[PDB]
């Protein structure tokens, strides 16, 4: 069994910025989700070998996780807040696509996503 390479977190020729919206995404959005009791399954790429999910990366072709997002934010990988918001949404959607309603992992994602939505509802206007 084999995992894919993780998503890119470094690319020196990708344009990047540090916007006030991106600072909010790190200091408020990521920090809130990361500390949550249900964060742990989402803090690193899905290890499809250790979890014995051999079809995971057959179904999930755009993997994302908060470990990857955390590194992207800390390394100022992004140009804009929409890029980062898309990553969070890709993470949640992958969970819903792969799993079944009412599974524990789906309940965990839902809890995290509720908080994500409440925080992004107050994303600041760009300075
Ligand atoms: C431990 O961290 C994770 C993270 C996950 O996603 C972010 C998942 C995830 O998306 N599905 C599952 C999961 C677990 C079991 C036992 C399942 O039945 C095995 C097939 O008979 C299925 C279909 C999914 N485990 C995760 C664990």
Swiss-Prot record:
Compartments reported by the entry: Nucleus; Chromosome
Source organism superkingdom: Eukaryota
Other noteworthy facts: JQ1, a thieno-triazolo-1,4-diazepine derivative, and I-BET, a benzodiazepine derivative, have been tested on tumors with success. Treatment with GSK1210151A (I-BET151, a I-BET derivative) has strong effets on mixed lineage leukemia and promotes myeloid differentiation and leukemia stem-cell depletion.
Protein name: Bromodomain-containing protein 4
Disease field: Cornelia de Lange syndrome 6: A form of Cornelia de Lange syndrome, a clinically heterogeneous developmental disorder associated with malformations affecting multiple systems. It is characterized by facial dysmorphisms, abnormal hands and feet, growth delay, cognitive retardation, hirsutism, gastroesophageal dysfunction and cardiac, ophthalmologic and genitourinary anomalies. CDLS6 inheritance is autosomal dominant.
Outcome, altering residue 99 to A: Abolishes binding to acetylated histones
Annotated crosslink Glycyl lysine isopeptide (Lys-Gly) (interchain with G-Cter in SUMO2) location: 58
Site (Acetylated histone binding): 99
Positions of the Bromo domain: 17-123
Organism field: Homo sapiens (Human)
Function: Chromatin reader protein that recognizes and binds acetylated histones and plays a key role in transmission of epigenetic memory across cell divisions and transcription regulation. Remains associated with acetylated chromatin throughout the entire cell cycle and provides epigenetic memory for postmitotic G1 gene transcription by preserving acetylated chromatin status and maintaining high-order chromatin structure. During interphase, plays a key role in regulating the transcription of signal-inducible genes by associating with the P-TEFb complex and recruiting it to promoters.
Tissue specificity as recorded in UniProt: Ubiquitously expressed.
Record note on modification: Phosphorylation by CK2 disrupt the intramolecular binding between the bromo domain 2 and the NPS region and promotes binding between the NPS and the BID regions, leading to activate the protein and promote binding to acetylated histones. In absence of phosphorylation, BRD4 does not localize to p53/TP53 target gene promoters, phosphorylation promoting recruitment to p53/TP53 target promoters.
Quaternary structure annotation from Swiss-Prot or TrEMBL: Interacts with p53/TP53; the interaction is direct. Interacts (via CTD region) with CDK9 and CCNT1, acting as an associated component of P-TEFb complex. Interacts with RELA (when acetylated at 'Lys-310'). Interacts (via NET domain) with NSD3, CHD4, BICRA and ATAD5. The interaction with BICRA bridges BRD4 to the GBAF complex. Interacts (via NET domain) with JMJD6 (via JmjC and N-terminal domains); the interaction is stronger in presence of ssRNA and recruits JMJD6 on distal enhancers. Interacts with NSD3. Interacts with NIPBL. (Microbial infection) Interacts with bovine papillomavirus type 1 regulatory protein E2. This interactions may serve for the tethering of viral genomes to host mitotic chromosomes allowing successful partitioning of the viral genome during cell division.
Family membership: Belongs to the BET family.
Comment field on protein domains: The NET domain mediates interaction with a number of chromatin proteins involved in transcription regulation (NSD3, JMJD6, CHD4, GLTSCR1 and ATAD5).
Designated gene of the protein: BRD4
């Amino acid at each position: 069994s084999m995992n894919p390479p993780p998503p890119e977190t470094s690319n020196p020729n990708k344009p990047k910025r540090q916007t006030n919206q991106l600072q909010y995404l790190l200091r408020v959005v990521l920090k809130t989700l990361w500390k949550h009791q249900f964060a742990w399954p989402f803090q690193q790429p899905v290890d499809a070998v250790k979890l014995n999910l051999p079809d995971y990366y057959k179904i999930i072709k755009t993997p994302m996780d908060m470990g990857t997002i955390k590194k992207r934010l800390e390394n100022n990988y992004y140009w804009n807040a929409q890029e980062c918001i898309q990553d969070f949404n890709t993470m949640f959607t992958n969970c819903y696509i792969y799993n079944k309603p009412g599974d524990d992992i789906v309940l965990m994602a839902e809890a995290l996503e509720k908080l994500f939505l409440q925080k992004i509802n107050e994303l600041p206007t760009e300075e």
